[PDB]
From a paper:
In this study, we designed SCM mutants by substituting the Cys41 residue with three hydrophobic amino acid residues—i.e., Ala, Val, and Leu—generating SCM C41A, C41V, and C41L, respectively. Differential scanning fluorimetric analysis revealed that substituting Cys41 with Ala or Val increased the thermal stability of SCM, while substitution with Ser or Leu decreased its stability. Furthermore, under all three different pH conditions the relative order of the Tm values of the SCM mutants was the same; that is, C41A > C41V > WT > C41S > C41L. The SCM C41A and C41V mutants were crystallized under slightly different conditions, resulting in having different space groups (i.e., P1 for C41A, and P21 for C41V). The mode of dimer formation in both SCM C41A and C41V was similar to that seen in the WT. Models for all 94 residues were successfully constructed for the C41V mutant, while the models for the loop between the β2 and β3 strands (i.e., residues Glu48–Arg51) in the C41A mutant could not be constructed due to poor electron densities. In addition, the two molecules in an asymmetric unit were superimposed Cα-RMSD values of 0.177 Å and 0.356 Å for SCM C41A and C41V, respectively. In the SCM C41A and C41V mutants, the main chain structures around the 41st residue were found to be almost identical to those of WT SCM and the C41S mutant. The superior thermal stability observed after substitution with Ala or Val may therefore be attributed to the absence of their side-chain deprotonation, which can decrease thermal stability, as well as their interactions with surrounding residues.
Author numbering: 1 to 47, 52 to 94
Amino acid sequence: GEWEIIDIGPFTQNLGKFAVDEENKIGQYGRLTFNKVIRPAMKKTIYEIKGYEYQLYVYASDKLFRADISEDYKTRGRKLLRFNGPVPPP
């Protein structure tokens, strides 16, 4: 696949919210409150397209985490791949 840097507009913020919502279902960090996604946001496109992956820096409950998210082209399904941290600011 190929990687590009993307903006941190509303669509990206909603991916961050997705990630925190999914991590809350897992419960590994306890209950987290989504704050914001910060730069840099990275997007991978996997080939007709199979899907996408995102690597995001997400503040939740005033702590910084790294979240990876997949998105399937044909099913539109999103999945949280991993959620790690706290991490230092980029």
